[PDB]
């Protein structure tokens, strides 16, 4: 429960993570949606769901300090369980990372899910997932098709995440109880 | 100069003000909009239009208290010399008027613009414009040439504002100097 996504540009990530709160794939709402751009068409995706978003571009705000003290407020106003980033492009900044430590996620290309933290390495990652160089490259499919898996990965670890079986503990992913190792993934032990 | 609009719906309204500062005859900006209502396409008219749109929703603040300290916060931010209400359905408070004032403008459908002055939309109606019902119009074709009149009047008393023309002394609105009669109007006779 108590989903805020922030996110730039259009919202394809997002659309995925709406429809699995929707049909119940995910136990949670999406409490509200982040942009620090306008344009945004994710923005336009989060209206047609009818939910709560709140483009906060800079330049607007005289410093980065000033704008992040700012989008932490309005985003601790929803009681966000999860921060999930997922598009967003503004350079984080310590005091971000560390105010939703363990409740942060994002997802980069090839295609992996991960813990946003301090560590040098990025943080923990959860769950990956490759996409062949098999030849039907009919390009513009290069990153289309990271793009399916992307649209299937996230809905499954932030329903993890909500069922509580996903925790952070000491910058290590655990997964149903145990420890996730480099580059994780599913059943258990 | 610096416009928020407030808007709950459709936001034909927002759209006439930001086509009225873009062509220049609103000397002043359409810093932000924002809106009680998740799915109003007036967002998506600021969207479009580059504007930076915030939404938020009665239920996600336990006292009306804090959704009110909540919207001042956020429309104090773009630092506002007119919010405008296009449309706004909420039942606002004395906190919110009291803070802005006469800053705070509305209109109403039979076209009278007005300045708010007490969280029961009473205040100074600064122009008025009536409209002609015919021999066989159907409720649209009247509400469509109200809508008209209020995308016309509207930006207007907000050119005369963002100009200094137009001010408001105790419950009174002034034009030029001159102390406007109860109905409004803008000249003398």
Redesign the interface.
């Given at each position: 429960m108590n989903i805020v996504v922030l996110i730039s540009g259009n919202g394809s990530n997002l659309q995925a993570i709406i429809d699995a709160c929707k049909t119940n794939k995910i136990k949670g709402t999406v409490?509200?949606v982040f942009s620090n751009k306008?344009?945004?068409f994710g923005?336009?995706r989060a209206?047609?769901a009818?939910?709560?978003?709140?483009?906060?571009?800079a330049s607007?705000?005289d410093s980065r300090e000033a704008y992040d003290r700012?989008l932490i407020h309005?985003i601790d106003?929803?009681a966000p369980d999860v921060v999930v980033l997922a598009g967003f492009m503004r350079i984080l900044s310590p005091a971000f990372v560390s105010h939703y430590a363990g409740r942060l996620l994002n997802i980069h290309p090839g295609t992996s899910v991960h813990f946003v933290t301090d560590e040098l390495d990025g943080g923990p990652v959860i769950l990956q997932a490759k996409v062949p160089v098999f030849a039907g490259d009919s390009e513009d499919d290069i990153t289309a098709r990271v793009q399916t898996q992307e649209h299937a990965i996230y809905p499954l670890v932030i329903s993890w995440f909500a069922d509580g079986r996903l925790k952070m503990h000491e910058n290590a992913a655990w997964l149903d109880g145990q420890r996730l190792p480099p580059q994780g993934y599913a059943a258990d032990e």
């Open positions: 409490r509200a306008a344009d945004a923005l336009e209206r047609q009818g939910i709560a978003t709140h483009t906060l571009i607007a705000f700012e309005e106003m929803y």
